[PDB]
Symmetry: C2
Subunit: 210 residues, 2 copies
């Protein structure tokens, strides 16, 4: 195998690392308002905001989209993958967020491709050639499936990385102490498991329904 | 169990996250010289410097110390843990690096302890009460053993986090392109596995022998 020298246990850490050079996650977009309006003011209200957000659009769009493209990639169904990306593109507002999401997806793909010693396989190659509105979550789904990374593991690492980013945004913006940030992340571990279990129960009919 | 709500699969990500608030890793200390002297000038020479460093003091002090305190914690042998920390303290130069390492170890312990909803167990509590010269690796070893995290997994996450930090330091300092940084990390995956296998073969008689 061309990937004999590749260890997915490290590669999954690598692509979820904050330094993986694809630009910043976009979760910060709809947070500034909550802070200005005195909605999020402390650890308690930050946690409630995070739990609500994680279980709404983050779940029914981002996490679910990852699961859907992962599953479709295993079936080698590019048409369904492009279909999922189309639904997301047509559902995302405002335009600035859509553009930021598309930029992030494109950068994720390009960053993988720049690692010439990593063979993503023909299906991924074709996905990269055809995608019009990639997102980080959908492209990551195809990536994980392509390399044979288990779905639940792929979801756990992605979920943690996204949520770490969300929490640090609250830490910096509210602001909160660093200790409060760590308490929040610890408090989110049970909800994380509930989110993954729920994600596995959903399907295309639930996509973008939050 | 007091830790019913804790999921080690997320907690291991949390404590290895660059945002875990303990201050910067100290690997950058002995790098500035290599760059000034035109020793590390590109991707190729950065990789060789990293491979050499990973297989020398990083292996025989840092990785091995983690393994040793993990093993001793399973045996509930605090005396041996303090013994390992003593050897490291007495072997580390210069004084500024020693102080930085001690500060990092102390911060790791304190950061864990500030998460009141995490029960580290009596052995860890006693370790925290008695440690004089903690380091990140030794305290992490006791932490991982205390929570029942498998040793090879604990080592993989720690190794990746440390090396990501080392690579980004080269990226910024040489400087290198971000793409070169990712190629280096990918190239290190086989060496990573060799390092972990070697770490498992070593014992107290090898500590600080590089």
């Amino acid at each position: 195998d061309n990937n004999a020298h590749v260890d997915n246990e490290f590669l999954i850490l690598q692509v979820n690392d904050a330094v993986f050079p694809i630009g910043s996650y976009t979760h910060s977009f709809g947070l500034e308002t909550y802070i200005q309006q005195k909605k999020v003011t402390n650890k308690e209200s930050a946690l409630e905001y995070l739990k609500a957000n994680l279980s709404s659009q983050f779940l029914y769009t981002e996490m679910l989209s990852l699961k859907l493209t992962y599953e479709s990639a295993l079936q080698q169904d590019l048409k369904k993958i492009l279909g999922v990306e189309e639904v997301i593109m047509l559902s995302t507002s405002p335009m600035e967020l859509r553009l930021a999401n598309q930029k992030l997806g494109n950068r994720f793909i390009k960053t993988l491709q720049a690692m010439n010693e990593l063979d993503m396989g023909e299906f991924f190659n074709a996905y990269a050639q055809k995608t019009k509105d990639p997102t980080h979550a959908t492209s990551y789904g195809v990536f994980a499936a392509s390399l044979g990374i288990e779905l639940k593991k792929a979801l756990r690492h992605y979920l943690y990385a996204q949520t770490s980013n969300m929490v640090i945004n609250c830490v910096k913006s509210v602001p909160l102490s660093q200790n409060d940030g760590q308490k929040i992340l610890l408090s989110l571990q049970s909800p994380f498991n509930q989110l993954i279990e729920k994600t596995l129960e959903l399907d295309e009919s639930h996509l973008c329904t939050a």
